[PDB]
Amino acid sequence: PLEEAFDWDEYPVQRVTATGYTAGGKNPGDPLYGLTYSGVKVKRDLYSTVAADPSVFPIGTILFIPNYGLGVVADTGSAIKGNRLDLYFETVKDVYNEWGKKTLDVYVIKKGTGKITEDELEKLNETKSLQVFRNQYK
Amino acid sequence: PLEEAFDWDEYPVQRVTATGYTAGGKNPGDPLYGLTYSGVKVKRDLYSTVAADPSVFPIGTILFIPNYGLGVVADTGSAIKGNRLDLYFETVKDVYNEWGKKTLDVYVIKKGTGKITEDELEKLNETKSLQVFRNQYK
C-alpha cells in the first residue's frame, strides 16, 4: 500500500485538523452538483479532491494523506481555515468502510417482539436515568 | 462514557459484520424519506435506529454497540443477512468525526499554482507508473 511504498518522510510534513465531507439548492442530477471551488467535480480516485485554506495549501497542492490517499487541493469553504483539511468521501458507507470497525462484538440487551413505534422509541430516548449520557449522541 | 459506565460483558455477546448507512426516488423533504422497515424514521440519538437480519435480531431488539451507542433494530435490507449490522449516521462528517483521525500529519508533495482543471486531474489519475495503486481508490 501507498503508506509503505514511498518514503513520505522525505517530504515536508504538516499537521492538520481533518474532517470528512461529501457533495450536496442542488440535487445529484443538476449540472452544478458536486463542483468544487477550483471548478472540478468532487472525486475519490488515486488523486482525490480535498478542501483546504488556500493561504496554507494553494489550489492544486498535492498532499499525501495517510489512510486516505493522494489529495489535490481543489475546494475551499468559509469554515475551512488555517491548518484544516476536509477529506472527500462519496458516501457514509465508504467512510465507515475505511475508518469504522467491521469486525465487532455487540451485546444483546433485550430481544425484540417484532415491532417498534415512534412513541416507544421516544420513551427509550427519554429514559430519565440515562439522560446524562444523551448529550453525547443527540 | 457508556462503554465503561455499564458492565456489558454481563449480557450475551454476538459478533457482527458492521457497515454504515444513511437515508436516501426520495428526497429529504418527502414524507416517506428516511423511513425504516419498522415504520419509524431513522434516528441518531441515545437509542439509534440500526438495520439487521430479523431472523438473527428481531425488530425491536436493543443492542449495545461499542463506540456507536445503544441501537434499536428498526430496519432491514435485502443485503443485510446473517450476523450483519448496518449502523445509521446522519452525514459523512458525522461518521468521520466518530471514527476518522482528526489529528493528522500530511505530506506536501507539490505546492499548487492556484488552479487545477479536469484535464489536469485526469492526467494525474492516469499516471502510468501509479496505476497499480489505483484499483484501491477508484
Residue numbers in the entry:
A (entry chain A), B (entry chain A): 73 to 96, 101 to 214
Paper text:
However, a dormant state in Firmicutes can be recapitulated in the laboratory. This paper describes the first structure of a group of peptidoglycan cleaving enzymes from Firmicutes, called stationary phase survival proteins (Sps), that are involved in survival in the stationary phase and are analogous to the resuscitation promoting factors (Rpfs) from Actinobacteria. In this paper we present three high-resolution crystal structures of YuiC, an Sps protein from B. subtilis. The overall fold of each domain of the symmetric dimer consists of a mixed direction six stranded double psi beta barrel surround by five helices. In all the structures, the final two helices and the last strand of the beta barrel of each half are supplied by the other chain in the dimer.
The apo structure forms a similar dimer to that seen in the R3 structure (in this case with the dimeric symmetry axis corresponding to the crystallographic two fold axis parallel to the unit cell b axis). In the apo crystals, the two fold axis is crystallographic. The apo structure is locally less ordered than the substrate bound structures, lacking density for residues 97–100 and for four residues at the C-terminus compared to the + NAG structure, which just misses one residue at the C-terminus. Otherwise, the apo form of the pseudo monomer superposes well onto the + NAG structure with an RMSD of 1.15 Å over 135 CA atoms for the pseudo monomer. The domain swapped dimers superimpose less well with the RMSD for the apo dimer vs + NAG of 2.81 Å over 241 CA atoms as a consequence of flexibility in the positioning of the pseudo monomers within the dimer. The NZ of K178 in the apo structure forms hydrogen bonds to both the main chain and side chain carbonyls of N173, whereas in the liganded structures this side chain is pointing in to solvent. The region 176–178 lies away from the sugar binding site, so the change is not a direct result of ligand binding. However the other end of the third helix lies quite close to the ligand binding site and the loop that becomes ordered on ligand binding, so the difference in domain position may be propagated from sugar binding.
